[PDB]
RNA sequence: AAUACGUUCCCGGGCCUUGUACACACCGCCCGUCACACCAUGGGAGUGGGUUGCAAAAGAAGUAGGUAGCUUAACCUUCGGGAGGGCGCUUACCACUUUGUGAUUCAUGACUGGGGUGAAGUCGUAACAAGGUAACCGUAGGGGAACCUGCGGUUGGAUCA
RNA sequence: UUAGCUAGUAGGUGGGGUAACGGCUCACCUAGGCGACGAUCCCUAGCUGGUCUGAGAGGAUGACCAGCCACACUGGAACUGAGACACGGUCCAGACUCCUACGGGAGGCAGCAGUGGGGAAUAUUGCACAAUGGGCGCAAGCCUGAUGCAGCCAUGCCGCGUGUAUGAAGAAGGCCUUCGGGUUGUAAAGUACUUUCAGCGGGGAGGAAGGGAGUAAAGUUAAUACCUUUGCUCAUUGACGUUACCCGCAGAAGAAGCACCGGCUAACUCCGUGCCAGCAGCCGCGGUAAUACGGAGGGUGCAAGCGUUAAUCGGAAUUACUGGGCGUAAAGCGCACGCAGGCGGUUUGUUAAGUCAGAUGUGAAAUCCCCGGGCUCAACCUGGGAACUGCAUCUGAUACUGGCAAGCUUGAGUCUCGUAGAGGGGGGUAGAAUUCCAGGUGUAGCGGUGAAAUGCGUAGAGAUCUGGAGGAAUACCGGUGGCGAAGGCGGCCCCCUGGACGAAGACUGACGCUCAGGUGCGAAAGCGUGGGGAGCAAACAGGAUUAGAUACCCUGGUAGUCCACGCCGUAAACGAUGUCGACUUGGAGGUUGUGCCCUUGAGGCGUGGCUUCCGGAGCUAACGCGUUAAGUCGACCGCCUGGGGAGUACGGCCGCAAGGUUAAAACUCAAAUGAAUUGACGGGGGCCCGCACAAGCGGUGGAGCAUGUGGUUUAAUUCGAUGCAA
RNA sequence: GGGAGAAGGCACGCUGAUAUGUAGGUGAGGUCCCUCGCGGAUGGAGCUGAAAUCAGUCGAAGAUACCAGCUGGCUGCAACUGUUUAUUAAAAACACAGCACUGUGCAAACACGAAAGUGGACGUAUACGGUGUGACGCCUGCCCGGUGCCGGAAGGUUAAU
């Protein structure tokens, strides 16, 4: 059934980028809010909006430059068939700095260039080309 | 081919067999010609190609083809085969060494000597 | 001079379309018994080796347990011997060896089931076009062999004026 | 293609034993333990640090070096000893070899050399304890086939040499040539300069620190004896050794080969061959101009080596974790249920197992790598460092995952009410038609194909009207319509019954998804038992067509089809598309609800479910699939690794049986394949023509002759053309 | 289900101990109830009594005598247990369960009896007679010319009358 819903909310921002969706729209959580925060906050959205009282909706407004799409490509790391947990120096580098890979570490959600920066590795969400 | 059907059933590996058995890992095993006998190769050629029919060392019992241009081979004479499938003779995957132990060089040959066994001329 | 009504067929062409397992391009390639030779493979009355299981017999030396017998320098000793020892006998364990009977594996075996390769061999012509009976799948029967027919299924079949 | 194993076996209590715990060993009791996370069984194997390869993850492998284990002719057993169940010890048995006075005895190179044998293949029956270490010894010293060295071997790695410069008469000679010439070629000759290495002679380090005498000082000591420590002069101790190295001599002298040249692959021309000889790593060469075979000339590549073979890895993303694929190329179980297993929505709190981070212990040294030192350089030797991707312990952090505890309601499900349905099971019944029977009419044909015939008919058929009997299937509805998970399901009625879907509510509150083994259903054909048996119809018979026709076509016709019970478990079981779930432009219809709006007439505005066609981005090898995906993704399962051999043998399980299921190898080929393109072809289609056919006139083929040919004949019957197009 | 008692092997006497006769069987007393008697519960005396383990010992030999399987392999024939040539043949012959064909609609067919009658059967097509074959598995192929048998009564020949 709904066995990923990490991976629900990245194909829906997949699939909303490749068919030139505005304000996508996913059923919210505390990981995809963690995950939507660090995408507004390096730039690969426009603004998240977490709307609703006992179950909420979480809205990504999707950002475009020249026509094309922002986010290139974006996949998962740790599926849960196959989780993928990474030492500090065994981190990844994704597209050779310019994109980013967003880690769960101990200190909360955050970008991989911030885990090296603090020192820590965690768990690889996925990798925001 | 997902990670859970690998480790319940594991990626088997890729092995495959030496095409050249009778040898034993042996780079060259000596021979004794049972016969020395001629046939003619499979189509598209046309030629009397010379096989000499060895008993090998290990108890082997398999053809060989001879190389160079004649040769002075009989029965009851020790050859070394070393190996290496003529293409269109079927069912033949040795050479006799040219130059080994009972079977002489070719008369007369000046260039690629190493390959059938004569001395440097003077 | 005769005759031409017309395209139903006869062959040779031209154009579009469709189908193709054919490209010296249908005078194309192609399938199977049969006959001869050769190789490997299975069954094969069996036969011979290797290894091993079981149930048993077995009992050299060695240890450990016991003890009538013989014997003994170290301790006690009234000198009598006593303890203790050694040899010997014996029981326990166990090797070689022996029988019986399987299990596996290799070699070999008249003859045979099929398979593969071969020089212009014999009998056909089943498949590829609607391959001239559309093929094919399953199953059953038949038959020199491709295969044929029954029952059910598939389009991976062709024509649509 | 090994699913059962285990009787001291798993445990207990008591005794014994061991350096020590322990079924280590016994007595007694309990009846256990091991097993799909692979027990047991078979085959192979010394393991590791490492080495080779690889960018890396890995793959192969265990030579030297180092650690550990095992064994010492084969099979045992114990003693002595700290330590062996003992390489050069004891005892027993065995095979082999040898001595014997025939009574009996001896021996164990997998120590170093060496021999015989095997093998494609691997060295001297060498010198020394000078060094390091060992054994004994207070020491001196002795023993040391460890070790240090020498001999051999291009076995590898590395270094060096075979001269250097000048030199055009571009010499000769070879080879080729468009007979100008080119090429070998500054290459050789020539003249000048050098002596590395091998040879000759001389000098010669370093591996040597120690040890032995004597003396001085101190320590013990009643003692300035003895002994020990510290220095102090002496002769001293090398197998290597004719050493490393340095110096002098004379001379270009003593020192270059192997493979390849068609593509891949750097390198081309002539001559000799003529499907012969032969080459080959693959594709292919050779049949009279061979850059592919053999020779020459030239060149290219490596170089004291070059190749051929064997073996590993790479390339091979060709077993894919990093890193593949499933509509048609090999590949989705026939379909569903479902245990174990895998994965699991969302909120809070705790725990901190996984995760991460610091420290500690550790990862033997050697090797690999980074800086460095030395052998003149390198190989090699060596100092320091990280690495040693691990393991464990302590200490933290709490995002994810897990446990644990409480909650939510969207996921999953239950109730209420309908709708639609060839969904299933059982029993009735209806008509049309076929066949059979019985009776009437009435007369000579019926039936049949391409054309006929076998067959049915003058015993009165076929046609025809009435009455029966029987079995099977359900015209029109009927439509890519519905239902079911798949197979499948088709007149009507009843009985039993599953499922779906829709509406407003309510409720439980993760109860979910997938599923190895396991089970259930599973068309047709087939089998068993017993019924029925109208049509149809394998087998079979007869008739034709045919060259033959064991086929199509015709006339008959038994199994079977059918009913109840079972068994088989297979299909192109097809959408050649596993299930579940999420997201992504549209149109056309169909079907079945349902909300609203005035159903204001057979409307209109939406939401569900299901279903067929066209198509977008996307994808795809292309075809095409395209919100029901073959798009973007996630969870779990199945399966493929070239074509045959072969879904076959053998073996297992199932089956009454046919056979099903699991399922290789030996060999053999360099392809087999999928999609699309251009042709060609069709006894495929459409359109069109032509002396093609039709409609006509005349002729050949019959006869005689002219002339050409095929054959025969000959001294020669010259040679060439031989489908149309001789 | 079988094969199978497959084959093949071990223990076996007496005495002592566990236990001065064990486990088990039987149950006298005695005690309590007692619906009171040939009643029922603990109660176990006495009586009997295997079988096993350990130790000892004897013999050449422990089931010591009598009684008491010869076993295995390949194959023919017949499925088997059965029955027969009393008195030369016990089988491969006969039967057999099973299979099929055929007759028979009950006043059955069929037999024994001139006939009554009776068996069939006091049974009714899942029954009965007759015939061939002889479990079970795989199967049963072609011929209707001959001789039978069944269906026809259109025609030729055809008796008594
Ligand atoms: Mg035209
Ligand atoms: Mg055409
Ligand atoms: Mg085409
Ligand atoms: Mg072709
Ligand atoms: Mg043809
Ligand atoms: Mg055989
Ligand atoms: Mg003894
Ligand atoms: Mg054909
Ligand atoms: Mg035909
Ligand atoms: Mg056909
Ligand atoms: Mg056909
Ligand atoms: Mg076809
Ligand atoms: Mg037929
Ligand atoms: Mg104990
Ligand atoms: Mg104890
Ligand atoms: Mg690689
Ligand atoms: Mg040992
Ligand atoms: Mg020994
Ligand atoms: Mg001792
Ligand atoms: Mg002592
Ligand atoms: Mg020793
Ligand atoms: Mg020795
Ligand atoms: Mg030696
Ligand atoms: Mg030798
Ligand atoms: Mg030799
Ligand atoms: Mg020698
Ligand atoms: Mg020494
Ligand atoms: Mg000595
Ligand atoms: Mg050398
Ligand atoms: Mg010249
Ligand atoms: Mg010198
Ligand atoms: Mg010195
Ligand atoms: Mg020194
Ligand atoms: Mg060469
Ligand atoms: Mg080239
Ligand atoms: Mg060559
Ligand atoms: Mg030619
Ligand atoms: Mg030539
Ligand atoms: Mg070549
Ligand atoms: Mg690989
Ligand atoms: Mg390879
Ligand atoms: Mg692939
Ligand atoms: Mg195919
Ligand atoms: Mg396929
Ligand atoms: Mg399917
Ligand atoms: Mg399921
Ligand atoms: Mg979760
Ligand atoms: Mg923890
Ligand atoms: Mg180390
Ligand atoms: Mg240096
Ligand atoms: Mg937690
Ligand atoms: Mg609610
Ligand atoms: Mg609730
Ligand atoms: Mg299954
Ligand atoms: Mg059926
Ligand atoms: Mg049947
Ligand atoms: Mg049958
Ligand atoms: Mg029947
Ligand atoms: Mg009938
Ligand atoms: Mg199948
Ligand atoms: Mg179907
Ligand atoms: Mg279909
Ligand atoms: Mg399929
Ligand atoms: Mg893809
Ligand atoms: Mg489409
Ligand atoms: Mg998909
Ligand atoms: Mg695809
Ligand atoms: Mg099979
Ligand atoms: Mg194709
Ligand atoms: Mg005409
Ligand atoms: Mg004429
Ligand atoms: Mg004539
Ligand atoms: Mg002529
Ligand atoms: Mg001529
Ligand atoms: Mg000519
Ligand atoms: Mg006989
Ligand atoms: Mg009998
Ligand atoms: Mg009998
Ligand atoms: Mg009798
Ligand atoms: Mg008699
Ligand atoms: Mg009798
Ligand atoms: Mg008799
Ligand atoms: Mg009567
Ligand atoms: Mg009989
Ligand atoms: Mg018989
Ligand atoms: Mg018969
Ligand atoms: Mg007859
Ligand atoms: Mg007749
Ligand atoms: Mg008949
Ligand atoms: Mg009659």
Do not use: W
Not at chain 1, 28 to 40: F, G, W
Not at chain 1, 79 to 92: A, F, N, Q, S, T
Not at chain 2, 102 to 109: A, I, L, M, P, T
């Amino acid at each position: 059934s709904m066995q990923d819903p990490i991976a629900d909310m990245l194909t829906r921002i997949r699939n909303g980028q490749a068919a030139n969706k505005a304000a996508v729209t996913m059923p919210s959580s505390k990981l995809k809010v963690a995950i939507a925060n660090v995408l507004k906050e390096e730039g690969f959205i426009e603004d998240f909006k977490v709307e609703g009282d006992t179950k909420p909706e979480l809205e990504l407004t999707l950002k475009y430059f020249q026509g094309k799409a922002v986010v290139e490509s974006i996949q998962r790391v740790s599926r849960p068939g196959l989780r993928i947990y990474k030492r500090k120096d065994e981190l990844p580098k994704v597209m050779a700095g310019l994109g980013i890979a967003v880690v769960s570490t101990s200190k909360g959600v955050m970008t991989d260039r911030a885990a090296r920066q603090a020192g820590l590795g965690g768990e690889i969400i996925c990798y925001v080309a | 081919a997902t990670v859970n059907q690998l480790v319940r059933k594991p990626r088997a590996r890729k092995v495959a067999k030496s095409n050249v058995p009778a040898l034993e890992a042996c780079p060259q095993k000596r021979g004794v010609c049972t016969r020395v006998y001629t046939t003619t190769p499979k189509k598209p050629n046309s030629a009397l190609r010379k096989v000499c029919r060895v008993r090998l060392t290990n108890g082997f019992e398999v053809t060989s083809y001879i190389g160079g241009e004649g040769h002075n081979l009989q029965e009851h004479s020790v050859i070394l085969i070393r190996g290496g499938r003529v293409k269109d003779l079927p069912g033949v995957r040795y050479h006799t060494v040219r130059g080994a132990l009972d079977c002489s060089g070719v008369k007369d040959r000046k260039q690629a000597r190493s390959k059938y066994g004569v001395k440097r001329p003077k």
